[model samples]
Target: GSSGSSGYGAWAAQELQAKLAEIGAPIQGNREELVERLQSYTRQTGIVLNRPSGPSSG
Candidate 1:
């Protein structure tokens, strides 16, 4: 279940990026970079980002 949730979250992120691009919002980074930024944000906010259970594991 956790793995599935993680996959869904990742898919949602890509969908969000696509939608942003479609609306002419500049998504300035590749997916890996974006994920890194997100993790950094989570850490800065004192939240531990969970490791994704799937193969991507990012």
Candidate 2:
């Protein structure tokens, strides 16, 4: 079955860049490194990272 929610695609990195810019966060590195930094940021912010399970049937 389809996940329903649009999964992160090629623009994910760009979205991250935008959010970082909004927070005045520095993003001076390669794409891989930037993703690593974003992951670190999520950890520091206590954000929960989880897989979507599709819309509730109820």
Candidate 3:
């Protein structure tokens, strides 16, 4: 499929920043800026931005 997946777009700005940090990416930017960064990462690393099926992993 193409880019702009709902998973990433659905996240809040802070959540996006946290994700960027988790992936060792920069975390300083506005909402759209963070989404762009994650999109690039997703493309480059074949990362799935979708949230896991459960609220708690454990």
Candidate 4:
């Protein structure tokens, strides 16, 4: 099955929930919302994203 991350792919929705629970952040929502909040955290903390930004032909 597909996992969360949308484009970040750092962790699945379940995993993200765990992370948020640990940090006491709002961990409620669907995949997109979960990923959105997680992404926001990354941006807020300056987490360097080393992945491609868009779809590319391989």
Q: Pick the candidate with the highest lDDT.
A: 3
Instruction: Give candidate 4 misplaced runs (Cα > 4 Å).
Output: 1-7, 47-58
lDDT of 1 by residue, 1-58 (tens): 4644332145446654654455465657777655555555556766544433445743
Superior by TM-score: candidate 3 or candidate 4: 3
What's model 3's TM-score? 0.70
- Model 2 per-residue lDDT tens digits across residues 5-47: 5323344566756656666887677677666776777779967
**If both were scored by TM-score, which would come out higher, candidate 1 or candidate 3?**
3
Q: Between candidates 1 and 2, name the one with more favorable lDDT.
A: 2
Top candidate when judged by TM-score against the true structure: 3
lDDT of 2: 0.60
What TM-score do all the candidates reach, one by one? 0.38, 0.52, 0.70, 0.55
- Model 3 worst lDDT window (10 residues): 49-58
The segments of candidate 1 whose C-alpha lies over 4 angstroms from its true place after superposition are 1-9, 12-26, 47-58
Any idea what lDDT model 3 has?
0.78
Q: Is candidate 1 or candidate 4 better by lDDT?
A: 4
lDDT of 3 by residue, 20-43 (tens): 888788899799998988888888
Better of 1 and 2 by TM-score: 2
